[PDB]
Amino acid sequence: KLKLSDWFNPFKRPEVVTMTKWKAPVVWEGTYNRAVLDNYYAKQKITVGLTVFAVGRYIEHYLEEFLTSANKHFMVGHPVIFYIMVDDVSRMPLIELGPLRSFKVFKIKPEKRWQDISMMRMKTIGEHIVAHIQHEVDFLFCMDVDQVFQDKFGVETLGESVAQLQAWWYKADPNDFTYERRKESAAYIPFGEGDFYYHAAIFGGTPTQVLNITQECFKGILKDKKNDIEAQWHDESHLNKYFLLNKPTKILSPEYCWDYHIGLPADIKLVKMSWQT
Ligand SMILES: OC[C@H]1O[C@@H](O[C@H]2[C@H](O)[C@@H](O)[C@H](O)O[C@@H]2CO)[C@H](O)[C@@H](O)[C@H]1O
Numbered sequence: 001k002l003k004l005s006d007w008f009n010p011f012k013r014p015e016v017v018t019m020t021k022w023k024a025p026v027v028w029e030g031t032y033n034r035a036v037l038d039n040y041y042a043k044q045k046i047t048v049g050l051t052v053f054a055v056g057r058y059i060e061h062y063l064e065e066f067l068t069s070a071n072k073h074f075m076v077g078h079p080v081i082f083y084i085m086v087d088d089v090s091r092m093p094l095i096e097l098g099p100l101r102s103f104k105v106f107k108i109k110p111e112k113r114w115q116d117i118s119m120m121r122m123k124t125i126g127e128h129i130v131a132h133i134q135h136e137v138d139f140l141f142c143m144d145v146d147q148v149f150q151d152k153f154g155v156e157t158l159g160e161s162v163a164q165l166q167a168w169w170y171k172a173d174p175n176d177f178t179y180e181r182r183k184e185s186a187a188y189i190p191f192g193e194g195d196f197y198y199h200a201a202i203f204g205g206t207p208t209q210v211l212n213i214t215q216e217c218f219k220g221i222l223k224d225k226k227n228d229i230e231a232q233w234h235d236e237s238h239l240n241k242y243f244l245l246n247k248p249t250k251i252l253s254p255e256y257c258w259d260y261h262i263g264l265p266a267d268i269k270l271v272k273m274s275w276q277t
Contacts, residue, residue, distance in 0.1 A: 002037075002040055004025060006033075006036055006040075007032060007033045007036045007037050007156070008025050008027075008031055008032060008033075009031055009032075009033070010025070010031055012028075012030040012031050013028040013029075013030050013031050015266075015267065016028055016253070016267055018031055020195065020247070020251065021195075022247045024247065024248060024249050024250055024251060025250055025251070026165070026251045026252075026253060027156055027157060027250065027251070027252050027253060027256070028253040028255060028269070029253070029255050029269040029270040029272075030269060032156035034152070034154050034155065034156055037154075037155040037156055037158075038077055038078075038154070038155055041078060041155050041158070042077065042078070044138075045079075046078060046079075046137075046138040046139065046155075046158075047078070047079040047080070047081060047136065047137045047138055048074075048075045048078055048079070048080050048081075048137055048138070048139045048140070048141070048158070049080070049081050049083060049133055049136065049137035049139070049140040049141070049207075050070060050074060050080060050081070050082050050083065050140075050141050050142075050143060051083040051085065051125055051128070051133075051140065051141070051142045051143070052066060052067075052082070052083070052084060052085070052142075052143055052144075052145045053085040053086075053108070053121055053124075053145060054066075054084070054085070054086050054092070054145045055086065055087045055108075055110045055117075056087065056088075056110065058145055058146065059086055059087075059088070059091050059092055059093075060091065061146075062145045062146045062276060063084070063086075063092060063093060063145055064093040064095060065148050065276070066143075066145050066146075066147065066148065066149075067082065067084075067093070067095045068095055069148045069149035069150070070082065070149050071095060071096075071097050071098050071101055072098070072149065073149035073150070073151060073152050073153050073272070074149055074153050074154075075153070075154055075155060076152060076154065077100070077154075078100060078155065079100045079101075079102075080100065080101045080102075081101075081102055081103065081104065081136055081137060082097075082101065082102070082103040082104070083103070083104055083106070083128065083133065084103055084104070084105045084106070085105075085106050085108045085121075085124065086105065086106075086107065086108065087107065087108060087109070087110040088107075089105055089107050092105060106128070108120075108124060114234055115221065115224075115225060115230050115234060116225075118200075118221060118234045118235035119218060119221040119222065119225065119235075121235070122214040122215075122217045122218040122221065122235060123214070123218045125142055125210065125214045126211050126214045126215050126218065129207045129210060129211045129214075130211070133207050134207040134208070134211070137207060138206065138207075139158045139159075139204060139205065139206060139207075140204055140205065140206070140207050140210045141157075141162070141202065141203070141204035142202075142203055142204060142210065142214075143201060143202050144200075144201035144202070146275070146276040147201060147257065147273055147274060147275050147276050148273065148274055148276055149272065149273050150271045150272060150273060150274050151270055151271065151272050152272065153256065153272045153273055157204070157250070157252055157256065158204075158250075159204075159205065159248075159249045159250035160205050160206055160209050160249040160250075161203075161204075161205035161206075161209040161210075161213070161243075161246070161248045161249050161250070162202075162203060162204040162205055162248060162249070162250045162251070162252065163196070163198045163203055163243050163248035163250075163251050163252070164198055164199040164201065164202040164203060164251070164252045164256060164257050165196055165197070165198065165199065165251060165252065165253055165254050165257075166197045166198060166199035166254070166257075167199070167254040167257060167258050167259040167262060167275070168259065168262065169196075169197040170196070170197075170253070170254050172197065174192065174193065174194040174195070174196075174197075175191055175192055177189075177194055177197040177240075178197065178232060178233060179194060179197070179232070179237060179240055179241075180231045180232045180233070180237040180238075180240075180241070181232070182229070184224075184227060184229050185220075185224050185229050185231050185237070186219075186220035186221075186223045186224050186231075186238065186241070187220055187224070187231040187232075187237035187238040187240070187241040188241070189240065189241055189244060193244070194240070194244055195243075195244065195247070196243075196251065197240065198236075198239060198240050198243050198248075198251075199236070199257055200233070200235050200236035200239045201257055201275075202252065202256065202257050202273070203239065205248075205249075212246070213239070213242055213246075216238075216242050216246075217235055217238040217239055217242055220238040220241065220242075221234070221235065221238055254267075254268065255268055255269065255270060255271055255272055256272045256273055257272075257273050257274075257275070258271045258272075258273070258274050258275070259274070259275040260274055260275070261275075
């Protein structure tokens, strides 16, 4: 079966972190052999899911560019199912999908407050995993709609649980991470603890693992809400708590979710997905 040495060469990028202390790969441009992996997973006939939520004007502002870029760049050569969650189905753009892509659309109940928006999104993802996604795909990613694929975002990103390094903080010391710091919050992390600052705009894994991520995050949000507290960065704070306790088996570099407002440092060799404008 697939071994890490079959496809991952950390020595191609010695100026960055490529392996965690728990021996998870951090995937940077140049460290991965996509050809080897494409052939391995083709033989296995895997399908990959992608969930995206879009409410109100986010539909018109972002959803078409997201879908158009994902069709062009996400897991090319492998079956993909787009799970599109919107509040108004009559407003959603119908994009032409390429070979091995298809979609499903669901009408959801929008929530007014950011706390309740993220709360219901983690709950909704878990419900869909149990109802159907666990039957439909081998790997599932959950992404924010307000970003754009720029280049191939492929099977090198698959794993049991996949976290994204947040672009502004990947070089920072953990003491400075914008973790939730009040012990009243379920997302509490003490100063000095933590491995990375993960970005809630991309995460994934097998459907089983993603069910656990979302169920734990939802419980923590709920627990905070019953105590009249709102984590500093809402689901992202709880996600960071979760991945501290349940280490990801693979991490993606900021090449996979890059904010061009930062600039283009030497570390960022080829951008696969960028924050919207
Ligand atoms: O800190 C979590 C929070 O980061 C925001 O991104 C910020 C970044 O944290 C800040 O240091 C920099 O000065 O500006 C960035 C945006 O302009 C994200 O926008 C937010 O989603 C969280 O991930």
